[PDB]
Amino acid sequence: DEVX
Amino acid sequence: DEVX
Amino acid sequence: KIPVEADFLYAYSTAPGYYSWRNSKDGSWFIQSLCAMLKQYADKLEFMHILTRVNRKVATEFESFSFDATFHAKKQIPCIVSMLTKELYFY
Amino acid sequence: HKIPVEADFLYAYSTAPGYYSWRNSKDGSWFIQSLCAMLKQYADKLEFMHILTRVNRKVATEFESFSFDATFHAKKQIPCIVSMLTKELYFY
Amino acid sequence: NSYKMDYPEMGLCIIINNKNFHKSTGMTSRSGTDVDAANLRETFRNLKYEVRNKNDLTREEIVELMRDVSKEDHSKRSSFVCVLLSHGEEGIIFGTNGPVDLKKITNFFRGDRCRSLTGKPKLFIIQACRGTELDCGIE
Amino acid sequence: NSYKMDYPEMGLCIIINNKNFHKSTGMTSRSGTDVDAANLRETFRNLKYEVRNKNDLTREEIVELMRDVSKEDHSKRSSFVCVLLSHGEEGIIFGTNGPVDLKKITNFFRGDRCRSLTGKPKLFIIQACRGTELDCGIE
């Protein structure tokens, strides 16, 4: 899970 | 007619 | 778990950055239309569809009248902001 | 007989105002995953706002962040439907 | 699926009607807003909401009201409705004596802060400006 | 009432897929966005939209693209769809080389600037951050  |  | 910002609905009278209009005798365009559409459709339509009809009413049936040319012949579109996770019916 | 120049716009945001948006490096972003899934499933049965509402519930209930960074772990996300539409939208 | 709307009560309907503002703010009277507040009152009365009309609240009065409402027990209520009728800015609603952040108001009712409303629809109806841009429209 | 959706065409579907960014932005590669762009392409293809995929567009290219699309003739199209897949901020989308105002992109399609889309639904799907706040959730 990554963030934008 | 007036604005808020 | 669910988000803490979930299940919110913000029914704005106008689009972001824009003026909101009000008639001195009839009341504001948005609240006029909101009550009308609620009165007519709250037992038939889902809330988002009611607000959509509120949108078309404010957008098509209202235009500002002012002696000040700066404030005359202006329009308004409401702004539905839904963080709801289910459909909403008032019945 | 005029309409607002800002009318008939719909902004489907992946996340609430001010918030991070989450993406899985292999599965893709939570929002787009759910949007395509719900569209594929309901585009011939539901109005677009109701589809997006189901997109909201999918992202809200079925996703939780996993991160090695403890600051970013076990976080949630709610999408944000912003409608300036004046009519109902059906894809059929 | 749809929100459970067959709780014992439909919920509160909090109408904050700001018409008159302190001269220190220089803000004008919002003529016609009483027509709004009364029509809202009637509409939501028919929707079986527990309506509470509030008139000319200060920025401090609004905060404490929304806070106290958030600490009520909405356990047997289906939903929550708040209507704001005042002057505004982007993200800002005006009390009679000054500005209030909308976020601060809404944050009282977040899922983790108002446990008795978690999973229930929280509706905020805002009649106020969001800036000073004019929509000139198109044919 | 409902939007008229039986024009000859359903409309355009513009998918802007930004995965790799210039070193000056400090933005990380957005792994997994290709899965999104392909899934969107199939989804809206099946909805009978004229899908156009764009990959790694600069801030200038995005603006010029949206301008060119807005100056197309949408007379026999029912709607318009734009999907933005990139890094973002509140009101901001990132081209591979820097930020773009969302307002600047959307303003091309306003009722008075894009007549062939007037009265037709203009959908903007944005997958990007809107700030740096985290939702810790509630059970």
Side-chain angles (χ1 to χ4, degrees):
Chain A
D1 294 318
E2 300 176 14
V3 290
Chain B
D1 284 332
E2 308 165 347
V3 289
Chain C
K1 221 155 75 177
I2 62 169
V4 304
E5 295 282 352
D7 304 320
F8 280 81
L9 191 161
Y10 311 89
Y12 293 99
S13 64
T14 188
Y18 280 86
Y19 279 114
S20 188
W21 290 92
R22 170 182 33 84
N23 183 266
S24 307
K25 170 195 164 292
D26 297 329
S28 66
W29 302 355
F30 178 62
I31 299 299
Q32 276 186 75
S33 313
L34 176 61
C35 291
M37 294 302 102
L38 274 178
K39 186 186 179 185
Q40 191 172 350
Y41 296 115
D43 62 336
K44 292 184 176 74
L45 295 184
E46 193 269 334
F47 189 41
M48 224 73 73
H49 290 175
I50 298 166
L51 289 183
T52 303
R53 279 176 195 261
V54 171
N55 282 8
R56 183 187 35 252
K57 203 183 169 304
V58 178
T60 55
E61 292 178 17
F62 293 86
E63 179 166 325
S64 73
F65 181 87
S66 175
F67 294 151
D68 194 335
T70 293
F71 291 100
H72 177 66
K74 297 307 151 177
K75 301 293 282 182
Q76 171 174 312
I77 182 69
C79 178
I80 312 159
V81 176
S82 181
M83 272 91 98
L84 293 185
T85 61
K86 292 169 173 117
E87 284 159 33
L88 178 57
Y89 302 86
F90 294 113
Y91 62 95
Chain D
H1 292 318
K2 276 154 55 182
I3 62 169
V5 304
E6 295 282 352
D8 304 320
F9 280 80
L10 191 160
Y11 310 89
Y13 293 99
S14 64
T15 187
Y19 281 86
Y20 279 114
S21 188
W22 288 92
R23 171 183 34 84
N24 183 266
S25 55
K26 322 65 187 171
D27 296 329
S29 66
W30 302 356
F31 177 63
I32 298 299
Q33 276 186 253
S34 313
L35 175 61
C36 291
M38 295 303 102
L39 274 178
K40 187 185 180 288
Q41 189 173 350
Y42 295 115
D44 62 335
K45 292 186 294 185
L46 295 184
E47 193 270 334
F48 191 41
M49 300 296 288
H50 291 175
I51 298 166
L52 290 183
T53 304
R54 279 175 195 261
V55 171
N56 282 8
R57 179 185 339 138
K58 202 183 168 60
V59 178
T61 55
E62 292 178 17
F63 293 85
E64 179 166 325
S65 73
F66 181 88
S67 175
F68 295 151
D69 194 335
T71 294
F72 290 91
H73 178 66
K75 295 307 150 58
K76 302 292 281 182
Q77 171 174 312
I78 183 69
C80 178
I81 312 159
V82 176
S83 181
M84 272 92 98
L85 293 185
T86 62
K87 293 168 173 172
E88 284 160 32
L89 177 58
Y90 301 86
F91 295 113
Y92 61 95
Chain E
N1 221 349
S2 308
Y3 283 112
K4 188 193 189 189
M5 295 299 290
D6 66 334
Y7 284 84
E9 314 174 36
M10 277 288 234
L12 298 179
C13 177
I14 303 303
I15 303 171
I16 302 181
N17 181 44
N18 282 2
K19 178 180 199 182
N20 307 285
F21 300 80
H22 301 165
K23 24 176 180 61
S24 65
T25 68
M27 297 187 149
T28 62
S29 285
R30 301 183 53 254
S31 309
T33 192
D34 281 348
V35 184
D36 284 347
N39 200 8
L40 289 157
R41 178 172 175 97
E42 184 60 31
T43 297
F44 280 99
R45 186 192 74 87
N46 290 127
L47 291 179
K48 291 317 179 167
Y49 277 86
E50 174 180 351
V51 182
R52 301 185 190 162
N53 283 80
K54 302 296 184 183
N55 298 310
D56 290 338
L57 299 196
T58 65
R59 56 201 297 196
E60 296 87 1
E61 287 175 322
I62 296 176
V63 172
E64 246 317 290
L65 169 67
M66 297 315 283
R67 180 181 304 155
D68 285 6
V69 168
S70 68
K71 291 173 315 204
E72 286 188 24
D73 183 75
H74 301 262
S75 297
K76 323 181 268 182
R77 290 165 186 164
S78 295
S79 59
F80 172 74
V81 176
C82 176
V83 182
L84 298 177
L85 308 165
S86 176
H87 287 296
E89 282 168 16
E90 184 67 67
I92 292 175
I93 194 71
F94 270 96
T96 60
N97 59 337
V100 183
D101 279 335
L102 279 177
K103 204 67 194 177
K104 187 173 199 230
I105 298 303
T106 59
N107 277 0
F108 288 120
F109 301 87
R110 276 168 40 173
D112 60 337
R113 220 154 294 151
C114 185
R115 305 293 290 100
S116 37
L117 277 180
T118 302
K120 307 180 177 164
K122 300 158 272 275
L123 319 179
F124 289 85
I125 303 170
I126 318 281
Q127 165 67 39
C129 281
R130 296 181 76 185
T132 60
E133 257 195 303
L134 287 162
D135 200 317
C136 294
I138 187 70
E139 318 132 50
Chain F
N1 220 350
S2 308
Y3 281 112
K4 188 192 190 298
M5 295 300 290
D6 66 334
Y7 284 84
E9 314 174 36
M10 278 288 276
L12 299 179
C13 177
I14 305 303
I15 303 171
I16 302 181
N17 181 44
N18 282 1
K19 178 180 199 182
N20 306 285
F21 300 80
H22 195 281
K23 54 173 122 147
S24 64
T25 67
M27 299 275 82
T28 64
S29 169
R30 300 182 52 254
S31 43
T33 192
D34 282 348
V35 184
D36 284 347
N39 200 8
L40 289 158
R41 180 171 176 96
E42 179 58 32
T43 297
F44 280 99
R45 182 198 70 84
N46 190 244
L47 292 179
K48 289 197 186 341
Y49 278 85
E50 175 180 352
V51 182
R52 300 186 189 163
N53 283 80
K54 298 295 186 183
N55 299 281
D56 289 338
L57 299 196
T58 64
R59 57 202 298 196
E60 297 87 0
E61 287 175 322
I62 296 176
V63 172
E64 97 185 359
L65 169 66
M66 298 314 282
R67 178 180 304 155
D68 286 6
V69 169
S70 68
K71 290 174 169 54
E72 285 189 24
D73 184 23
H74 302 262
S75 298
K76 21 191 308 175
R77 290 165 187 163
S78 294
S79 59
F80 173 73
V81 176
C82 175
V83 181
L84 298 177
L85 308 164
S86 176
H87 288 296
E89 281 168 18
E90 184 68 67
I92 293 276
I93 196 71
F94 267 73
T96 60
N97 58 337
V100 184
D101 279 335
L102 279 177
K103 205 67 194 177
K104 183 171 198 200
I105 295 172
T106 58
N107 277 0
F108 287 119
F109 301 86
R110 274 164 40 146
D112 59 337
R113 287 188 184 71
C114 185
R115 290 292 211 110
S116 36
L117 278 180
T118 303
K120 308 180 177 164
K122 301 157 237 241
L123 319 180
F124 289 85
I125 303 170
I126 314 105
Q127 164 67 39
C129 281
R130 297 181 76 184
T132 61
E133 263 276 302
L134 286 162
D135 199 317
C136 295
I138 186 70
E139 41 284 49

